[PDB]
């Protein structure tokens, strides 16, 4: 796996959407650049998962499960309604949700990067590399 290394170093929750920075380091000449980053929303991860599941050539392969939709409704309701004690627990709550959802999204990508077949998939490469919003693409 050392030729393709993916991590999510930061993320942003705004209104009802969560954007993740997806950072790639690779030694593969099947990517344009050895290190790059893109912004991806949760929906884009769901699209990538579905696309793989629907690729008939991959039937039988172990496709890692999609990350679940992050849930910031509770924290966001506290934030709006809302002292230093109460504000500290709010940040802790946000932080706990972020650590979990960043982990699930990152693990999905890391599992794809390790798979000898799925790591080569064109849609996976687009997901990592394409330096525009994928939502409009699809």
């Amino acid at each position: 796996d050392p030729s393709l290394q993916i991590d999510i170093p930061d993320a942003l929750s705004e209104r009802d959407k969560v954007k993740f920075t997806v950072h790639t380091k690779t030694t593969l000449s099947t990517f344009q650049s050895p290190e790059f980053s893109v912004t991806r929303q949760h929906e884009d991860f769901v699209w990538l998962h579905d696309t793989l599941t629907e690729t008939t050539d991959y039937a039988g392969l172990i496709i890692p499960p999609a990350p679940t939709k992050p849930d910031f409704d509770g924290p966001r309701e506290k934030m709006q309604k809302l002292f230093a004690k109460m504000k500290q627990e709010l940040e802790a709550e946000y932080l706990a949700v972020f650590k979990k959802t960043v982990s699930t999204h990152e693990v999905f990508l890391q599992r794809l990067s390790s798979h000898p077949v799925l790591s080569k998939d064109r849609n996976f490469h687009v997901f990592l590399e394409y330096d525009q919003d994928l939502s409009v693409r699809r």
Binding site: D7, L12, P75, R76, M79, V102
Partner: peptide, 21 residues
Amino acid sequence: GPAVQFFKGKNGSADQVILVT
């Protein structure tokens, strides 16, 4: 309106959250 930004601390640092807007 409101937005909250997360930074992973990774190996050495610890994680941070910042209220934006």
